[PDB]
Amino acid sequence: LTKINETESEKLLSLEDTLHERVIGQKDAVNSISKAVRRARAGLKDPKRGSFIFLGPTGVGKTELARALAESMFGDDDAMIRVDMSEFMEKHAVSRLVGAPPHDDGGQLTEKVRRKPYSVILFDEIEKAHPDVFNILLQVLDDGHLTDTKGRTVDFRNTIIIMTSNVGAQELQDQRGQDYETIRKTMLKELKNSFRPEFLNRVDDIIVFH
Amino acid sequence: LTKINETESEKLLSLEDTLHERVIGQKDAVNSISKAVRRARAGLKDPKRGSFIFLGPTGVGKTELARALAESMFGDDDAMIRVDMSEFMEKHAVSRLVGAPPHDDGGQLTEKVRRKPYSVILFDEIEKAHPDVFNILLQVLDDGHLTDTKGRTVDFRNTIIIMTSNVGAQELQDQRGQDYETIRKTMLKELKNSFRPEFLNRVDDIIVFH
Amino acid sequence: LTKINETESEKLLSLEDTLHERVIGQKDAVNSISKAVRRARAGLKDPKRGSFIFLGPTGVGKTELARALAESMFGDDDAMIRVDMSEFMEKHAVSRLVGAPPHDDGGQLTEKVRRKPYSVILFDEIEKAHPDVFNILLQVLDDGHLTDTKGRTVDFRNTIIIMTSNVGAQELQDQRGQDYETIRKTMLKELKNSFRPEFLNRVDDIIVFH
Amino acid sequence: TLDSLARDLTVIAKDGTLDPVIGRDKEITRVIEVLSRRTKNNPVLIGEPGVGKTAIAEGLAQAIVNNEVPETLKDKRVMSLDMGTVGEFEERLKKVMEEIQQAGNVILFIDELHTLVGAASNILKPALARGELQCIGATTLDEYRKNIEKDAALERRFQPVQVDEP
Amino acid sequence: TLDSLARDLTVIAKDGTLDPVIGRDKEITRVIEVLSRRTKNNPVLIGEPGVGKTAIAEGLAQAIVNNEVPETLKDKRVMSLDMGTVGEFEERLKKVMEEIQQAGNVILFIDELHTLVGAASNILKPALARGELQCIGATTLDEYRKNIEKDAALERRFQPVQVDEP
Amino acid sequence: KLTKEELKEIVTMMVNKLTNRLSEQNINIIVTDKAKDKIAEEGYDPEYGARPLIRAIQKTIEDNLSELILDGNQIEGKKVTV
Amino acid sequence: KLTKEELKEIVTMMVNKLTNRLSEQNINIIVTDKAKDKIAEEGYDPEYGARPLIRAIQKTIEDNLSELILDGNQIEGKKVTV
Amino acid sequence: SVVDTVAILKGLRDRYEAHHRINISDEAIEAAVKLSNRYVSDRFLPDKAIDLIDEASSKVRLKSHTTPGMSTSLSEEDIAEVIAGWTGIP
Amino acid sequence: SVVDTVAILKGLRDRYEAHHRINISDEAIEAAVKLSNRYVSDRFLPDKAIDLIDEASSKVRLKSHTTPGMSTSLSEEDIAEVIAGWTGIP
Amino acid sequence: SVVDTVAILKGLRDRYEAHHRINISDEAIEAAVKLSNRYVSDRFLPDKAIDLIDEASSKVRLKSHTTPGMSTSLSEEDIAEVIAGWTGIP
């Protein structure tokens, strides 16, 4: 049916109330996300260019959303790729991006994209990962495609990526129901700390979970 | 038309105002570059001998210039070759220069020159790359041609190479609008640190971006 | 003409002013070298027995000399062999000297001598190379010929070898114009540190670059 | 003889059996001009398979029967390889070579696998290396890295060319 | 000739020698439509062994003798491989190929091991690669990773398809 | 030094990616120098250069589009800005 | 220490590569000591030595040639400088 | 180039429709040309278009071949459906 | 030697022009001789010149062969163009 | 041994001179024997001498063969020249 119908606007037009079928709260963000991924079309932004920093906890739907997203979008959640920023330290760039001597190994989630060009990419308290990765994170942010250790450059725009932060765990104390604009700002710099904005500037938008 | 006209001085004579069609600032360097590549003719220097250390940031035109250069010079930017000094560590010399047992692999940008004898070569905060490479960097600086792992020696003078440095990121604080001669000197030794001058002495000239 | 004339004394007799055609400074060493290689004849030393430790920097002519040497001596510089002491660690003895199981590989510069029996051999801050090599370095120093992993023993006296040291980089501060005898001594022990003299005792002589 | 595996599309092009190409003209101009060479008449192609290259070949053959082919080659004619097999095998393939060399009037295009084989290696490759018999190969470099290159005299026999997706 | 190893189940299906299949129809529709291709008439299958696939094959053959086969192939007929061996061996297997190519009227299904062998490699595989002789393979990918793929031109010869347990 | 020239000059080629991709979306584009400069004003930083501009632009710029992509009032192949 | 001698002296043999290659281009060469020295002035650095000179020269030097290689006004086998 | 492809497809435009007895609509033709290039890595728009095309040309014929009158190939579904049949989210 | 080559080329000078119906201009002949030796590693000026030559002799004939009157082979383009066709930056 | 070689060369002394119509001078004969052993790694003085010899025997004959009267083979040049022709720095 989705294979059938998928007119290319039924999601979008309904995507909120579509998405609304899932997780209460962040309706805006939900909307924003809906809003966002619509820019994943029209190519008014870089046709090669899906970048979401979750501000939230466990139980926050960070998974759900991301799950449901392609499960909504790509009609499955297996498009998603878990990636542990705990596992991002110094040299995993190889195990991110094909070595070729240093076996020759590259991509925990890439070859999976080499497997699955339409996908979703989850990262974990992502700033937890090292200034090592930020550039290869930036690689994603770069150009909206993904180069490889063998060099192969592949579209991100045909996939999604996910960023998560508990950074405001404190600053959550605000919505633990205060106006987020406090913590929004309050976390912003805090994560803005970890990242040259340019990093942050290819973000779709930052995602609170309240 | 360029195929037509290219008299062998129209660029040169106009090359500034040619180049000026592109990126404001570094007009001198632009000029110098124009000045430089003219020595890429006349053979008054070694006919086998194009070497540019960019002092600058993102947005600094480091790419633009280099892009436009052959895009100006060779009437295309695909002559250029991106090379990640991050990817230059210890043994990539093989993956720079043909192995032959250690498959047999050589040149991330070479075989591309083996593909494309008229080209441009970009390196990245280049001193970021290892004293490993400096000699095979020096190989470029050597003799103005490029030997291979199979041994094949090929002209650099028929291509361009690019060096980039954020080293003065601090020292940029000067032109963040102070007289560069400070930071020029101030970065000079700083990069002069990383390199035996002989390395630096085959440079066309160091390129600030202010 | 050299093929023609080469009487076997025209070099020698003129070798200084011959060599003087090249690099100012170290005229003595130049002379010494001239002096030296003359002992490469007369067989008053071991007819099987050309060993030069360069004390100097980049730009120091270490290359030039060595280059010009056979380029003077053997009427070409391709007799020379670059060898990276950086690349001399533990097991390269095989890749110095034919394996035969451990493919079967031997000589980065040997098989080249197996190729070219009249040659020149460059080593790099040589003490940078490992006590691994000193004995196979000593192999050169040994007997004035070169055994192989297949066993083949071949004359060094029909070639040249080169040793380089920046060791006095500090101690260069002397001639950075002080009497070298200071640094001569001062570096001597310093390199004498790295080597049992016997190593050093087959040297033609140590070569300063001032 | 000069049949079975020996076949040509030129007449077929004069027969109109095939498709008028576009755009690889100056591309072919090269491929064409490869034959001019006393050194290497024999080009090989790199690129993406299935893209029209053997029609790009035919493009020559059209331009041949078009007589867009200039002089020397105008008498010569395409041969489109046939690949198949049947005691020994290759000797046939070996055999045809003198025949076409006897033909004094044609050219063959070797197609894709120019092969490092078990049963192989130098087959015509010497008669290739004979410095005679104008022929054309093609592949993508992934193969090109080997046979033409691992000799390098077949590299000295072959002229590589590639064209991007139109 | 065209016997011994050469055999067919189509008549056997018209003989009713075998089982009416179910459900792989549109699956076969693909397998069917593979033959349509000037590029690759020749499918291969992936999946779980012993599941009905060679009957899925027969499913075609039924749909063939059913004339659920559309036009071009309707004249053509199944061949079910026979595997066995007997001086040389494969040359026979090599031999039959022209015979069936001579047949102008059939198709063979190659069955499972499409083999990287000691005595082997390219056997018919060129005559396969000849770009003629509509045929079908099958395996599970575990093998598929190699022969069709390690060439990739046999990949360019073969069309992979797989179906889950019904 | 990268002159005010360069700033707004690069601010041009900044637009390129938009056009060379989006309008290549196919949507006409208007340019308010003032804002562009007001942007370029905030666009160029000493330290980081104008480099933030990429982000700087996209934020509101792609937005107002994406917004007016929704707004159904004035739509593709038009142009509007702030 | 490498005396002012050496500086301009090397500045000579600096010219050699030009001549020994280019004019070996075949183009006569004039030498303005002042500029040469003005060059040599900026030519020698304490730290790096005059070593930059190689670059230093080529930049403008090969240029003005390459320039006057174009300029069609005064041409090969002449000599001009700054 | 995608466009030349269309032309070369226009080259085979008559070809497989005269095989598949259909009417190619260049709308489709350019469509997949973009779309395949967008969505298909492996084969090449010089073909893979026609792949889609002929396959679309089949799918129509398929419907048109047997029980589903349009002999022409639509732009969209011919691309879309098939392409959605290729992937999803039409 | 480059020069002897010219002579040996002068040897085949009549040869392939009487094949290619053109007029060789020794200017070209010496030209590539230097130039190829300069620009071509692999084949040998004993040939590669003639290679260029015959190829130039083709390229002219090519133009001269069909629609582009000079039967002679220029110095420059014959070298140059072809050599630029060989490499670039004429 | 170098010396036995001379003898074994003396063995073939008549041989190739009666082939090459020359007069071998043992001075040469012992000469290369040392000299080749000195200068030639690969072939063996049991031969390589004679190699030089016959080659010298040629070179003389060569000169003697055609326009350059001595039928004998010199010590030196026969060794030397040829050996210098082998290497250099006579």
Identify all chain B residues contacting C103, using CB atoms and an 8 Å cutoff: 101
Chain C / chain J CB contacts < 8 angstroms:
9
Cross-chain CB nearest to I65 (options D39, D70, D156): D70
CA distance F35 to E48: 65
* Residues 6 or more apart in contact with residue C201 via CB below 8 angstroms: none
| Separation between Cα atoms, residue H53 and residue B46, nearest integer Å | 57
Q: What is d(CA B40, CA B204) in angstroms, rounded to the nearest whole number?
A: 10
Strands A145-146 and A154-155: antiparallel
**D16 part of contact set with chain H, CB < 8 Å:** no
Name the DSSP class of F78. Answer: -
Q: Judge whether J88 is closer than 8 Å to chain C, CB to CB.
A: yes
Q: What whole-number distance in Å separates Cα of residue F67 and Cα of residue F82?
A: 13
The CA angle A107-A111-A112, to the nearest 5 degrees, is 110
Query: How far is the C-alpha of D105 from the C-alpha of D10, rounded, in Å?
Result: 12
- The sign of the CA dihedral A203, A204, A205, A206 is negative
**Cα–Cα dist A161/A128, whole Å:** 16
Which of A44, F19, F50 lies closest to B23, judged by CA?
Answer: F50
Pairing of strands A51-55, A205-208: parallel
Q: Which residues lie across from A122 on neighbouring strands?
A: A82, A162
Binding residues of E: 47-54
Q: Which of B171, B189, B191 is nearest to B179 (CA)?
A: B171
d(CA A59, CA F33): 47
Which residue of F5, F10, F14, F17 is the best one to mutate when testing the B interface, meaning the one whose CB has the most B CBs within 10 A? Answer: F10
What amino acid occupies position E121? S
Among positive and negative, which fits the CA dihedral B38, B42, B46, B48? positive
Contact criterion met (CB below 8 Å) for B98 and B108: no
Mention every residue, 6+ apart, whose C-beta is less than 8 A from residue D70: D32, I58, I61, I62, I64, I65, I66
Measured distance CA(D121)–CA(B88) in Å, rounded: 38
C-alpha distances in Å from residue B124, one per residue of A92, A94, B162: 20, 18, 8
HSE of D49, CA atoms in CB hemisphere, 13 A:
17
Phi, psi of B122 (to 5 degrees): -100, 130
Neighbours of G, requiring at least 3 CB pairs below 8 Å, are B, C
Residue C164: phi and psi, rounded to 5, are -125, 145
Tell me the resolution in Å: 11.0
3-class SS string, chain I: CHHHHHHHHHHHHHHHHHHHCCECCHHHHHHHHHHHHHHCCCCCHHHHHHHHHHHHHHHHHHHHHCCCCCCECCCHHHHHHHHHHHCCCC
Looking at the complex, does the CB of residue B158 fall below 8 Å from at least one CB of chain I?
A: yes
> For helices B27-39 and G53-71, what crossing angle results, to 10°?
80
For C95, name the nearest residue in chain B, comparing CA atoms only.
Answer: B102
Q: Is residue A121 classed as helix, strand or coil in its secondary structure?
A: strand
| H or E element that contains B155 | strand B154-155
Reading the block at residue B16, the tokens are 């500034």
Number of neighbouring beta carbons within 10 Å of residue C117? 17
Ordered DSSP codes for A91-135 = THHHHHS--S------TTTHHHHHH-SS-EEE-SSGGGS-HHHHH
Residue G28: name the closest of B7, C21, B44, B36 by CA: B44
Nearest to A52 by CA among A192, A164, A190: A164
DSSP string, E33-99: HHTT-SS--EEEEES-TTSSHHHHHHHHHHHHHTT-S-HHHHS----B--------SHHHHHHHHHH
d(CA A122, CA A62): 9
What are the residues whose beta carbons fall under 8 Å from the beta carbon of C42, sequence distance 6 or more? none
Q: What are the C-alpha distances in Å from I58 to residues B154, D72, I50?
A: 28, 9, 11
Q: Which residue intervals of chain C are DSSP H helices?
A: 2-5, 10-19, 27-39, 62-72, 92-96, 110-115, 131-141, 172-175, 180-194, 197-201
CA gap C133, E28 in Å, rounded: 69
Question: With contact defined as beta carbons under 8 Å apart, do D61 and D17 qualify?
Answer: no
Q: What is the 3-state secondary structure (H, E, C) of B51-85?
A: EEEEECCCCCCHHHHHHHHHHHCCCCCCCEEECCH
Q: Do D165 and H5 touch (CB under 8 A)?
A: yes
What type of residue is G67? E
Q: In what order do the strands lie in the sheet with A51-55?
A: A80-82, A120-122, A160-165, A51-55, A205-208
Could you tell me which chain H residue has the CA closest to the CA of D24? H4
Structure tokens at F16: 């390129």
Q: Do E95 and D82 touch (CB under 8 A)?
A: no
Distance CA E2, CA B181 (A): 90
- From the annotation, which residues of E make up the binding site for ATP? 47-54
Cα–Cα dist E83/E4, whole Å: 10
H65 part of contact set with chain E, CB < 8 Å: yes
Cβ–Cβ below 8 Å for D50 and H15: no
Instruction: Give the pair of three-digit tokens for residue G16.
Output: 């050699």
Tell me which residue of C175, C62, C32 sits closest to C124, measured CA to CA. C62
Question: A101 and B92 in contact by Cβ < 8 A?
Answer: yes
Q: Which residue has the tokens 């002096």?
A: C35
First to last CA, chain I: 25
CA angle B181, B182, B185 (to 5 degrees): 75
DSSP-assigned beta bridge partners for residue C120? C80, C160
Cβ atoms E57, E136 nearer than 8 A = yes
Q: Give F45's DSSP letter.
A: B
Q: Is chain D adjacent to chain I, meaning 3+ CB pairs within 8 angstroms?
A: yes
Q: Name chain F's partners: 3 or more CB pairs within 8 A.
A: A, B
Please give the Cα distance from C53 to C32 (Å, whole number).
12
Token pair in block for residue B197: 């001058």
Shortest Cα distance, chain B CAs vs residue A193, angstroms: 18
Cα distance between residue E61 and residue E9, in whole Å? 7
> Which residues in chain B are contacts of A101 at CB distance < 8 A?
91-92, 94-95, 102
Amino acid at D98: E
As a dihedral over the C-alpha atoms of residue G43, residue G45, residue G51, residue G54, rounded to 10 degrees, the angle is -20
Residue H34 sits at the chain D interface (C-beta within 8 Å): no
Q: Determine whether A86 is exposed, middle or buried from the number of CB atoms within 10 Å of its CB (0-12, 13-18, 19+).
A: exposed
Which chain H residue has its CA at the smallest distance from A74's CA? Answer: H89
Residue with token string 């008559």: H14
The neighbouring-strand residues paired with C208 are: C55
Tokens at A90, concatenated: 């110094």
Of B86, B95, B108, the CB nearest to A101: B95
Give the one of D38, D67, D70 whose C-beta lies nearest to I54's C-beta. Answer: D38
In our burial notation (b when 16+ CB lie closer than 10 A, e otherwise), range A164-202 reads bbbbbeebbebbeeeebeebbebbbebbeebbbbbbbbb
Q: Report which residue type is found at G70.
A: L
The C-alpha atoms of residue A117 and residue A152 are separated, in whole angstroms, by 12
User: Which CA distances in Å does E93 have to E87, E122, G39?
Assistant: 13, 12, 83
Tell me how far the alpha carbon of residue A18 is from its chain's centroid. Answer: 20
Distance CA C205, CA C203 (A): 5
Q: What is the interface size between B and G, counted as CB pairs within 8 Å?
A: 103
Q: Take residue C69 and report the two structure tokens written for it.
A: 């040497």
How far, in Å, are A5, D27, E14, H82, H83 from residue H62 at the CA level? 20, 39, 26, 12, 15
Residue count (chain H) = 90
Distance between CA C87 and CA C82 in Å, rounded? 11
The owner of tokens 């070369």 is H8
Q: Say if the Cβ atoms of G22 and B39 lie within 8 Å.
A: no
Question: Within an 8 Å CB–CB cutoff, is residue F55 touching chain A?
Answer: yes
Q: Give the pairing of strands A120-122 and A80-82.
A: parallel
Q: Are C208 and C26 in contact (CB under 8 A)?
A: yes
Distance CA(B95)–CA(A104), nearest Å, equals 12
Looking at residue B35, what DSSP letter applies?
A: H
Which 3-state string (H, E, C) describes E146-158? CHHHHHCHHHHHE
Angle at F47 between CA F41 and CA F49, to 5 degrees: 50
Percentages helix, strand, coil for chain G, rounded to the nearest 5?
60, 0, 35
| Type and span of the H or E element at A206 | strand A205-208
Structure tokens at G54: 């190689």
Bridge pairing between strands B145-146 and B154-155: antiparallel
Q: What gap in Å lies between CA C124 and CA C93, rounded to an integer?
A: 16
